[PDB]
Amino acid sequence: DSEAVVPADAVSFTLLQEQLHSVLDTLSEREAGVVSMRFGLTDGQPKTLDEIGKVYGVTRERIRQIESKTMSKLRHPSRSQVLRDYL
DNA sequence: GGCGACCCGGCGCCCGCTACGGAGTCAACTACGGGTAGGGGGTATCGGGCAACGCGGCACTGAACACCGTTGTCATGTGCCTTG
Numbered sequence: 001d002s003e004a005v006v007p008a009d010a011v012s013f014t015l016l017q018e019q020l021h022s023v024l025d026t027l028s029e030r031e032a033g034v035v036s037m038r039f040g041l042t043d044g045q046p047k048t049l050d051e052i053g054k055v056y057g058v059t060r061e062r063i064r065q066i067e068s069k070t071m072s073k074l075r076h077p078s079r080s081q082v083l084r085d086y087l
Numbered sequence: 088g089g090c091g092a093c094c095c096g097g098c099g100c101c102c103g104c105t106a107c108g109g110a111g112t113c114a115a116c117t118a119c120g121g122g123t124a125g126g127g128g129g130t131a132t133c134g135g136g137c138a139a140c141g142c143g144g145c146a147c148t149g150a151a152c153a154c155c156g157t158t159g160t161c162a163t164g165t166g167c168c169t170t171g
């Protein structure tokens with residue numbers, strides 16, 4: 001069957017979740033939060049940049065600028081060795 | 088007319104696992120009518136990229152004072168020489 005949850009894949013996904021969440025915890029609180037909402041780690045629906053700029057109280061271009069800032073920071077080789085292997 | 092065999096159905100099972108071949112199938116027709124489903128066409132709505140402002144760290148503004156620190160300064164005290 002195809003509907004079976006392969007234990008190896010499920011456990012790898014859980015480990016990826018934990019490692020990624022730790023990596024965001026390395027980032028600043030606001031930066032980690034905004035990138036999380038932009039990619040919906042907390043909830044299955046990611047929020048657009050303007051969509052993030054309502055609960056947090058930032059403007060769509062301001063939140064956009066920090067989204068660019070988050071993507072850069074997670075792109076430095078520091079917080080990249082761990083997540084390269086998980087793909 | 089309940090016993091009785093007998094008859095019959097009817098059923099029930101028939102050690103363990105791995106490991107180990109392939110495969111794949113004979114007989115209507117057309118007309119309509121709708122409804123949906125897709126196609127492009129065009130349109131309101133949401134999202135991403137630049138100019139003006141605000142900060143914020145520090146930095147300069149040294150300017151204006153302060154902190155030691157220094158050789159200015161000195162009227163006023165020991166030591167030798169001359170005279171009582």
